[PDB]
Every structure is written in structure tokens, then in C-alpha cells.
Amino acid sequence: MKQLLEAGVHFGHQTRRWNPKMKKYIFTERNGIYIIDLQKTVKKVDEAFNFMREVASDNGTILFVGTKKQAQESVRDEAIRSGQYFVNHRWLGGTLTNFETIQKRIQHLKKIEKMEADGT
RNA sequence: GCAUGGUUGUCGUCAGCUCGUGUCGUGAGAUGUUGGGUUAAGUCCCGCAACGAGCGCAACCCUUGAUUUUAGUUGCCAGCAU
Numbered sequence: 543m544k545q546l547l548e549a550g551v552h553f554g555h556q557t558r559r560w561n562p563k564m565k566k567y568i569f570t571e572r573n574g575i576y577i578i579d580l581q582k583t584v585k586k587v588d589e590a591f592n593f594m595r596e597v598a599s600d601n602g603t604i605l606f607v608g609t610k611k612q613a614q615e616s617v618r619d620e621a622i623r624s625g626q627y628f629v630n631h632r633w634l635g636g637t638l639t640n641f642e643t644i645q646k647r648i649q650h651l652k653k654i655e656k657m658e659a660d661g662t
Numbered sequence: 663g664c665a666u667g668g669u670u671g672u673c674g675u676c677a678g679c680u681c682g683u684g685u686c687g688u689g690a691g692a693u694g695u696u697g698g699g700u701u702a703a704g705u706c707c708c709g710c711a712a713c714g715a716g717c718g719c720a721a722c723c724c725u726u727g728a729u730u731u732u733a734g735u736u737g738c739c740a741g742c743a744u
């Protein structure tokens with residue numbers, strides 16, 4: 543349910559393209575591809591589970607960020623179901639530091655949308 | 663006219679000149695404005711740590727090509743007499 547459940551395609555990247563900081567997270571070395579300690583994955587996903595417990599115990603706003611082309615259906619669908627927020631296309635430079643300009647553009651689209659339907 | 667105001671030529675109606683808020687730089691600064699396409703054009707698109715805006719481009723002005731209403735003299739003459 544936590545170790546054997548995933549199985550399938552849960553391997554790493556090629557040996558040439560790797561980060562040394564991950565030496566503790568590698569199980570074995572396959573042909574180029576590395577192998578990741580699934581035993582570890584369980585503990586740390588449990589800590590992520592508990593951290594999101596603490597975060598979302600109160601009414602909190604969260605963002606699902608994902609652009610990798612094998613990601614842009616999920617983040618959208620569980621963000622819609624969970625009612626939280628997501629960015630699935632490219633990340634515009636400064637959506638948080640320039641939150642003011644981004645929300646001006648949001649207000650622009652929203653106002654012209656009420657123009658289209660609620661207005662003339 | 664080499665002390666000036668005003669008026670004009672020229673590149674050339676060529677496509678440029680900048681700002682606000684963010685980020686990257688010890689700093690002067692940088693990015694946007696670089697790259698690939700497309701356009702008459704910084705015209706637009708796709709990329710991309712930038713998101714937008716302003717003066718220049720374009721539009722508003724004049725004329726020409728089609729047509730409707732209003733108006734028939736000094737304009738026009740079709741069906742009618744001269």
C-alpha cells in the first residue's frame with residue numbers, strides 16, 4: 543500500500559545526469575538509470591502528509607505548480623476537485639513578487655468578462 | 663547665421679526613444695528592447711525572469727472607386743407639345 547503499491551515505472555535518471563547531493567537517495571545503479579530507495583519514499587511522504595495536515599487544518603490557500611508535459615492534467619483536476627489553486631502552463635516571471643501586476647491583469651480579464659456577459 | 667529667436671533642408675515616413683513595478687549585479691548598470699519566424703512597421707506570434715504602459719508605426723482628417731435617403735435651380739430630358 544506504500545512500498546509495493548507504486549512499483550511499475552519508479553526509476554531514476556541516467557548516471558551522467560545526476561546530482562551528487564542525492565547520493566543518500568540511490569538504491570542501486572542500473573544501466574544508466576539509478577534506483578531509488580522506495581523504503582525512504584514511504585517515511586518522507588508520511589512527513590509530507592503530516593505537514594500538509596498542519597498547513598490545511600486551517601483555511602489555507604495552496605498552489606499546485608507543474609509544467610512538465612507528463613503533468614498537465616492532474617494538477618488541474620485535483621486542484622479543481624480540492625478547490626485550491628494551480629498553475630499548469632508556464633510560470634510567468636514574478637506571479638508572487640509582482641502579485642500586484644498579476645492581479646491587475648486578472649482584474650482586466652474579469653472586468654472585460656463581465657463586459658462580455660453581464661455587460662453589453 | 664561661429665552670440666541668438668523664429669522658419670527650413672538632410673538622413674527619412676527610416677523604425678526607433680523611453681517609463682512604472684519586479685528580479686539579476688558590491689557598484690555604475692542590466693532585463694523588458696536578446697533568440698527563431700512573420701510584417702510596410704518595436705506589426706504580430708512562439709520562446710524566454712519578466713508583467714505592462716507611453717511618445718513614434720497603425721487609426722481619427724482630405725480625396726478617389728459602389729450605393730441609399732434628403733433637395734431639384736442656373737443642373738438633367740425619359741415618356742409628352744414646341
Ligand SMILES: [Mg+2]
Pocket residue numbers: 663
Ligand atoms: Mg552671415
Ligand SMILES: [Mg+2]
Pocket residue numbers: 663666
Ligand atoms: Mg543661430
Ligand SMILES: [Mg+2]
Pocket residue numbers: 663
Ligand atoms: Mg547654423
Ligand SMILES: [Mg+2]
Pocket residue numbers: none
Ligand atoms: Mg557660414
Ligand SMILES: [Mg+2]
Pocket residue numbers: none
Ligand atoms: Mg538655426
Ligand SMILES: [Mg+2]
Pocket residue numbers: 664
Ligand atoms: Mg563660421
Ligand SMILES: [Mg+2]
Pocket residue numbers: 673
Ligand atoms: Mg537615422
Ligand SMILES: [Mg+2]
Pocket residue numbers: 678
Ligand atoms: Mg536610430
Ligand SMILES: [Mg+2]
Pocket residue numbers: 695
Ligand atoms: Mg532600443
Ligand SMILES: [Mg+2]
Pocket residue numbers: 696
Ligand atoms: Mg543583450
Ligand SMILES: [Mg+2]
Pocket residue numbers: 704
Ligand atoms: Mg508599437
Ligand SMILES: [Mg+2]
Pocket residue numbers: none
Ligand atoms: Mg499615421
